[PDB]
Design a binder for these strands. Structure first.
Ligand SMILES: [K+]
Ligand SMILES: [K+]
Ligand SMILES: [K+]
Ligand SMILES: [K+]
Ligand SMILES: [K+]
Ligand SMILES: [K+]
Ligand SMILES: [Mg+2]
Ligand SMILES: [Mg+2]
Ligand SMILES: [Mg+2]
Ligand SMILES: [Mg+2]
Ligand SMILES: [Mg+2]
Ligand SMILES: [Mg+2]
Ligand SMILES: [Mg+2]
Ligand SMILES: [Mg+2]
Ligand SMILES: [Mg+2]
Ligand SMILES: [Mg+2]
Ligand SMILES: [Mg+2]
Ligand SMILES: [Mg+2]
Ligand SMILES: [Mg+2]
Ligand SMILES: [Mg+2]
Ligand SMILES: [Mg+2]
Ligand SMILES: [Mg+2]
Ligand SMILES: [Mg+2]
Ligand SMILES: [Mg+2]
Ligand SMILES: [Mg+2]
Ligand SMILES: [Mg+2]
Ligand SMILES: [Mg+2]
Ligand SMILES: [Mg+2]
Ligand SMILES: [Mg+2]
Ligand SMILES: [Mg+2]
Ligand SMILES: [Mg+2]
Ligand SMILES: [Mg+2]
Ligand SMILES: [Mg+2]
Ligand SMILES: [Mg+2]
Ligand SMILES: [Mg+2]
Ligand SMILES: [Mg+2]
Ligand SMILES: [Mg+2]
Ligand SMILES: [Mg+2]
Ligand SMILES: [Mg+2]
Ligand SMILES: [Mg+2]
Ligand SMILES: [Mg+2]
Ligand SMILES: [Mg+2]
Ligand SMILES: [Mg+2]
Ligand SMILES: [Mg+2]
Ligand SMILES: [Mg+2]
Ligand SMILES: [Mg+2]
Ligand SMILES: [Mg+2]
Ligand SMILES: [Mg+2]
Ligand SMILES: [Mg+2]
Ligand SMILES: [Mg+2]
Ligand SMILES: [Mg+2]
Ligand SMILES: [Mg+2]
Ligand SMILES: [Mg+2]
Ligand SMILES: [Mg+2]
Ligand SMILES: [Mg+2]
Ligand SMILES: [Mg+2]
Ligand SMILES: [Mg+2]
Ligand SMILES: [Mg+2]
Ligand SMILES: [Mg+2]
Ligand SMILES: [Mg+2]
Ligand SMILES: [Mg+2]
Ligand SMILES: [Mg+2]
Ligand SMILES: [Mg+2]
Ligand SMILES: [Mg+2]
Ligand SMILES: [Mg+2]
Ligand SMILES: [Mg+2]
Ligand SMILES: [Mg+2]
Ligand SMILES: [Mg+2]
Ligand SMILES: [Mg+2]
Ligand SMILES: [Mg+2]
Ligand SMILES: [Mg+2]
Ligand code: NA
Ligand code: NA
Ligand code: NA
Ligand code: NA
Ligand code: NA
Ligand code: NA
Ligand code: NA
Ligand code: NA
Ligand code: NA
Ligand code: NA
Ligand code: NA
Ligand code: NA
Ligand code: NA
Ligand code: NA
Ligand code: NA
Ligand code: NA
Ligand code: NA
Ligand code: NA
Ligand code: NA
Lengths: 74, 92, 53, 59
RNA sequence: UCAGGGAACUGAAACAUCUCAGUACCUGAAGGAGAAGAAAGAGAAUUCGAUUCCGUUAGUAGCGGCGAGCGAACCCGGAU
RNA sequence: GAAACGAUGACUGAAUCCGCGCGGACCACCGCGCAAGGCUAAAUACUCCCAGUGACCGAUAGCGCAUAGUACCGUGAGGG
RNA sequence: UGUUAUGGCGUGCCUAUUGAAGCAUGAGCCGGCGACUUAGACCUGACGUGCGAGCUUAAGUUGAAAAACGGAGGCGGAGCGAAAGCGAGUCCGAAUAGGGCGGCAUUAGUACGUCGGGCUAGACUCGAAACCAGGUGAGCUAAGCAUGACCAGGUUGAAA
RNA sequence: AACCGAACCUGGAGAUAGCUAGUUCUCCCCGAAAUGUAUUGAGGUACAGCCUCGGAUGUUGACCAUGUCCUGUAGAGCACUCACAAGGCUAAACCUUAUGAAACUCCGAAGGGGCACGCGUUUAGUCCGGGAGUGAGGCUGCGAGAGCUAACUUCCGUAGCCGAGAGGGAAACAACCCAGACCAUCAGCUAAGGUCCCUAAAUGAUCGCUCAGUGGUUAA
RNA sequence: GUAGGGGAGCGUUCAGUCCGCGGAGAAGCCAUACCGGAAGGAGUGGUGGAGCCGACUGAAGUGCGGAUGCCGGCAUGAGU
RNA sequence: GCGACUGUUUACCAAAAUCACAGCACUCUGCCAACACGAACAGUGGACGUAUAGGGUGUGACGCCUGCCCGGUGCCGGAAGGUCAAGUGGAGCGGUGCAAGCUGCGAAAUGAAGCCCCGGUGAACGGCUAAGGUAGCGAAAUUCCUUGUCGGGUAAGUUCCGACCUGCACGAAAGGCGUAACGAUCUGGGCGCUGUCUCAACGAGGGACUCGGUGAAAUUGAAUUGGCUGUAAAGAUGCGGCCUACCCGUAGCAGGACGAAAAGACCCCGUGGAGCUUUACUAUAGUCUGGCAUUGGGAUUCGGGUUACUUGGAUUUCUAACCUGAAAAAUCACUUUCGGGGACCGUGCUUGGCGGGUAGUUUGACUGGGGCGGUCGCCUCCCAAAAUGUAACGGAGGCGCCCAAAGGUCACCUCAAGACGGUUGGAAAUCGUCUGUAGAGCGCAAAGGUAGAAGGUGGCUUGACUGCGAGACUGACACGUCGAGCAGGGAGGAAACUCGGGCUUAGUGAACCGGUGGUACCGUGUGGAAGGGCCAUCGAUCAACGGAUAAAAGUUACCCCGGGGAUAACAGGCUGAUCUCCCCCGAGAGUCCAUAUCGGCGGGGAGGUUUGGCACCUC
RNA sequence: ACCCCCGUGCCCAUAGCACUGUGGAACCACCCCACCCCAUGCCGAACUGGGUCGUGAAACACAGCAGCGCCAAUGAUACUCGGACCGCAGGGUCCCGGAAAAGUCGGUCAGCGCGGGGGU
């Protein structure tokens, strides 16, 4: 059926090396793909958001469990 | 009434009672040589409005002994004029 | 949010003395009677609060 | 139009739209938490122009 | 000018209210003008003080499927 | 609409001096005013008619007409 | 300058369109007529000028080969709030979270004029089928009423 | 009363008309759009996008390199799901061999995207405010769906041109190839294309092919 | 370079002002090989028989190829 | 065949089978009739009639006749009960004041016509679930399949006649069947006759042609206006190439100039119009009805209060109002004898119902034209071409909920499956021991995600809290999403910590208007109150789901207007499924032999004559 | 400094399973008892309380082993940015760079810290 349709969104919002801020949202997902790392809190829809300022660092331990972190500048 | 106007959720309640005339503290103090306020000679102090009472508000910070005869005044204004010499007189 | 003769009924929120509305959708399916709860209004807080009207 | 007088769009210092939240208030409510107590302020930088033109004078 | 009687298109991007509008038309009566007029008023100052018209109040107060849109009066100035 | 007051058709039907009406259901207080009788310049409107004037026309304009409501069309109102 | 032979080159105009020389629209020719205006102390902006923390009158009066008088009033000047109200602060709130607003290192307005545009009027010009009011028509035509007129000649041959 | 599913005349009345037509002097500068969302909306409107003018800001623009991160397409693959060829074993499962996949993924480029910075070249962007128009696109290439892997078909993504783009080429010809017209000239070099004659330009050079008029309409 | 925005100007009528022209002759019309970046302007001649350029400034009933546009005149169809 | 007949109709394309008639039927009407015209209890028509008289409706001489079904609709009648308007009446509630008192809201009961309910009526609508075709007729003007089957007529008959039957979809007053006569009616056959034909000729006259005289019209971008082929918006005189062609007329033909005329009939579009229809919305003429005026008297019964004064409803009866008739001075005004009706009716105000007679309107959009069908919001995959995003009437499947626990917190447990072995089993399961990155589970659809849990249980509880929210994702806006921290106070845990609904992504919707609780801002002289505001919350298949109005269906071939090649039917263009034709391989038939002829399954092309697709010029 | 054991991290299969050997009072485990605190919707299996013997069998630790897993070159190819072409078409080629998957060689059954304990 050519009926129904859904715009949807999702994806990563703050990539690597990006200097974020306390409140910015990092990535929007549906499950636990990118898991909350150091200085990275996780909303109810599995959304990652920053707790302070820093540099978005990415971390891949061979797929399976992704992690994002933040290293302050100062 | 359908293009950015209505569909908006308000009402409140319209009243509009008494509007007072702001008299900046810097108008009395600072310049001028106190020619008495009262209620007639103050018309020449660039505060000509009529039909409404007069309010005294504090904005200029400067020590000077002056006397003020308006219709109503603010707390701060009263604790600002007397603090430097003077007396604010209100209708009985 | 359709409201009809069917099961469950949007139940109000009341208090002894206090005056507060939680507004919680219940149901009469299984247990439907003991809708006694506890919700602190804008008083001294911590008060006998049921949503059974 | 007199409606505009009691409609959130008052004339502020700068001259912009004073709006609220027309998400859901009275009829039809009883889900979420603070979505109800979300009666803050609204501001639009694309419909001010075509809005204050029916109340700018009667500020 | 006053009075009796009194539309519709149109507008509400449809249409029943409401607008158009007491517009148009019809009719009666009268003049060089008519209407109105000497307070069981306006109004909130224990005030002004026949009526009409002009300015202003103000497009405020207020009316309205609270929509389209409609819209006074008092104070004050002036013709008399 | 909380809807006063004026007005009117049909039923009813008050007082008058420690009186009556009103002051945006209603009540007390308070305040203004006294109907059911009449007449009455001016300031106001308009313009057939007249004079004067015009960053008004100069005849495919200007009134329709530099005269004509004629010729002409229609049974007629009417058009022209 | 005029005219002309020859060579090269060369798909009217407008409109409407994805796309026109179009076998899509318009138009015989010329002349003349013919379409973005005007109004409202209205709203908003640009420009210009006079004043300037103040800036201006309206109706009208008196004068008119000229204009002055007229400050009732409107705009500045404080904001915030549903409102009472309070005030450089006010709303939500049982005091500290934020929205709006002053101060930002810093930004004055007002009147008039011309101009861009908005609004309310017929609002750029021309154009309809239709709706409403008043009135004119049965001298054509469909009928009625009243009173009059008209139907050569021939045939068939009912009742009594 | 020569045209009646509601007469005629006058008037309301310049009725409405999201419709069709028309809209006049000149040169100079910039220069669009047929997309998104909503609409009793679909040929109409609002708002955004795109245009111009002014002011402020004044390199934040653009291309490109490096660094970093994110996305599972093409391919591929048989480890899950569906399907599937042969045989062994005793229908399934399992084993050997062999597959196909938009809604399968053990794996996984090119490229793309965000941020920082400029090792370098260049040039604009954002904000505030006045006026807009446009919201019917078209063709080709590539990547898809729909359709018979049909259509000058239709519907999306992306690049270019036409639309508003003259000039050269392709005979003629919007789109294709080459190229963006400030004005003047009996001046010169090139591109795409060609160089017997009808138009300008070697019936040019060397080594081959093709007896066909192939070139100058197609296949089993 | 279309829609569109911005800028500088030409031309016409009326108005104020200034310099003026006109019977040895205005405007208008007719011809032309000159001038200006465009809108356009000028010289000379012909016609004409009364009025009218230029400059500056103000105001508009201000610029036509179209609308099966309006009025008027004259063509084609044809000596049919 | 139809209609019986004479007759009548569309002035100007329809004379008929239309209409109309005599005849028949149903029904209404008691006479100021029913009915009708009308602003008007005036007047008039019906009718100077009055019950085989008049109005309405259907059928349509005449003959034989006219069945079955009243469930619903309509109507007539009956009517216990059920509900229902104004009004009569008044408890309670409420406001203001010191009070008297003055005042809002507001019932039980009672209350008219109707409606519901019961029955009946069909020459009323209407059917053949309330029952199902009595006679007659039958492929007939009903006919589809169909040119049906047989016979007649003809050399040959699709129509015509006669029968039969499977009557798509005949049928007894929207009458069935038949019928002499009648018919500018319709159909078939025959005779006679003929230029109607084979097949044209000859002759005449009036025009056409010539001369003299008079002298229009529609039309017209401009013209110095060929042919073939190709290109161009897709059928070329102005484009390309080639061919042909001296200049200019007259008489003639009509292929072309997508020739003229009329902004198009059809079709679509427009929130355009008009006429018409009804069980679309709504109102009204009209009509019915209760109460109240005009509008009084005498009794009985029933209601009650007051100390017979009565106040009302109903029945009854009489009259001065009122109405109507006769005679003397026809219409009346008048006095009168009187006649009858006579408190009803009529009329005025008010209530309720009925009401297409009339009036004003609504009746969506997408859409490979429109209709019909189907679809609009939200969630998940795929398409989507590795950020995001991205269409179609593209490909699949869901939601408009649920859970007092499936929440919070704190503890605790580990799945599906197979094998081996066991008893009501002998497939699965119940048990046990192994294997087992989960091949399970997570309320539902799907994807992502989850083994250290977001799988499964238990204890304690109500964070499914209030006042807020820096800073971000997302949208044009309006929405929508996520969130640390802070405050007042709570929950579980020893504690750190966590919690402001559920693994997440659907389980929903603006504004207006109103209901309920609360707080006390305003409250138009003041002090209150009504009322309004604010906090909270309730009402919505508004499903056409960013929602139009509180409230709405159809028809037009009688149609009108404004537009569109933006959009269909004809044609042409593009394509070539389908159609047509050719070709390849060859199993086999052809006694033997593939190919003298024929060519299973299957494949490759051509043409552009089919039905189409697409929508390119032309509305 | 040597080794070893125990605990706890980085690392989260090139550090995993299977097979096999070694270890015996310093440490670890099984075991014994277990009316009560506490507890398995039944069972002190596991949670848990109090501690001898024995054993190391099982589990755990270490070591050998690479049969299977896991990881995984070079070379070439698939695909592709960009540049330029061919067929009516489904499609396909050339140049210039980037560059898979699979399979093959091979590679290794870890490596790197902190703390405590007991031995030479
Ligand atoms: K033009
Ligand atoms: K200025
Ligand atoms: K549109
Ligand atoms: K003959
Ligand atoms: K002649
Ligand atoms: K054609
Ligand atoms: Mg709140
Ligand atoms: Mg009236
Ligand atoms: Mg009254
Ligand atoms: Mg004239
Ligand atoms: Mg003339
Ligand atoms: Mg051209
Ligand atoms: Mg032509
Ligand atoms: Mg043409
Ligand atoms: Mg056209
Ligand atoms: Mg006559
Ligand atoms: Mg005779
Ligand atoms: Mg006629
Ligand atoms: Mg008009
Ligand atoms: Mg209209
Ligand atoms: Mg340019
Ligand atoms: Mg809308
Ligand atoms: Mg809508
Ligand atoms: Mg716009
Ligand atoms: Mg693939
Ligand atoms: Mg579009
Ligand atoms: Mg497109
Ligand atoms: Mg196309
Ligand atoms: Mg265009
Ligand atoms: Mg050429
Ligand atoms: Mg050269
Ligand atoms: Mg070359
Ligand atoms: Mg040459
Ligand atoms: Mg050839
Ligand atoms: Mg003279
Ligand atoms: Mg003009
Ligand atoms: Mg013309
Ligand atoms: Mg023409
Ligand atoms: Mg003419
Ligand atoms: Mg001749
Ligand atoms: Mg001729
Ligand atoms: Mg001739
Ligand atoms: Mg007949
Ligand atoms: Mg006729
Ligand atoms: Mg047959
Ligand atoms: Mg025979
Ligand atoms: Mg019948
Ligand atoms: Mg006859
Ligand atoms: Mg025959
Ligand atoms: Mg002859
Ligand atoms: Mg040619
Ligand atoms: Mg030519
Ligand atoms: Mg020849
Ligand atoms: Mg002819
Ligand atoms: Mg048309
Ligand atoms: Mg039609
Ligand atoms: Mg309509
Ligand atoms: Mg209307
Ligand atoms: Mg994507
Ligand atoms: Mg992509
Ligand atoms: Mg799209
Ligand atoms: Mg509304
Ligand atoms: Mg919608
Ligand atoms: Mg509504
Ligand atoms: Mg007709
Ligand atoms: Mg038409
Ligand atoms: Mg077209
Ligand atoms: Mg046809
Ligand atoms: Mg056809
Ligand atoms: Mg066709
Ligand atoms: Mg198309
Ligand atoms: Na305010
Ligand atoms: Na509310
Ligand atoms: Na309207
Ligand atoms: Na009059
Ligand atoms: Na003249
Ligand atoms: Na009008
Ligand atoms: Na271009
Ligand atoms: Na070509
Ligand atoms: Na000249
Ligand atoms: Na009949
Ligand atoms: Na019958
Ligand atoms: Na037959
Ligand atoms: Na036969
Ligand atoms: Na020629
Ligand atoms: Na109607
Ligand atoms: Na209240
Ligand atoms: Na065809
Ligand atoms: Na390429
Ligand atoms: Na390569």
């Amino acid at each position: 059926n050519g009926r129904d349709s859904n715009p949807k969104y999702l994806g990563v919002k703050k990539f690597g090396g990006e200097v974020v801020k306390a409140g910015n949202i990092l990535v929007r997902q549906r499950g636990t793909k990118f898991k909350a790392g150091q200085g990275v809190g996780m909303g109810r829809d599995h959304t990652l958001f920053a707790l302070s300022d820093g540099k978005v660092v990415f971390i891949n331990k061979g797929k399976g469990a992704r992690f994002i972190s933040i290293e302050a500048a100062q | 009434r359908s293009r950015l106007i209505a569909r908006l959720p308000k009402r409140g309640f319209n009243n509009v009672g008494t509007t007072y005339e702001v008299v900046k503290l810097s108008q009395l103090q600072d310049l001028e040589d106190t020619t008495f306020d009262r209620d007639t000679l103050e018309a020449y102090r660039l505060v000509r409005r009529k039909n409404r009472p007069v309010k005294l508000l504090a904005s200029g910070e400067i020590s000077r002994a002056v006397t003020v005869h308006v219709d109503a005044a603010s707390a701060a204004a009263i604790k600002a004029v007397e603090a430097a010499g003077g007396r604010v007189v209100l209708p009985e | 949010a359709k409201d009809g003769p069917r099961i469950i009924v949007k139940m109000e929120s009341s208090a002894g003395t206090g005056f507060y509305y939680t507004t919680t959708k219940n149901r009469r399916n299984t247990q439907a009677k003991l809708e006694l709860k506890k919700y602190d209004p804008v008083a001294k807080k911590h008060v006998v609060f049921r949503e059974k009207k | 139009t007199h409606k505009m007088a009691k409609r959130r769009i008052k004339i502020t210092g700068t001259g912009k739209v004073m709006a609220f939240k027309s998400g859901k208030r009275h009829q039809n409510t009883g889900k979420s938490g603070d979505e109800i107590r979300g009666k803050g302020k609204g501001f639009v930088l694309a419909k001010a122009e075509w809005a204050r033109m029916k109340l700018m004078l009667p500020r």
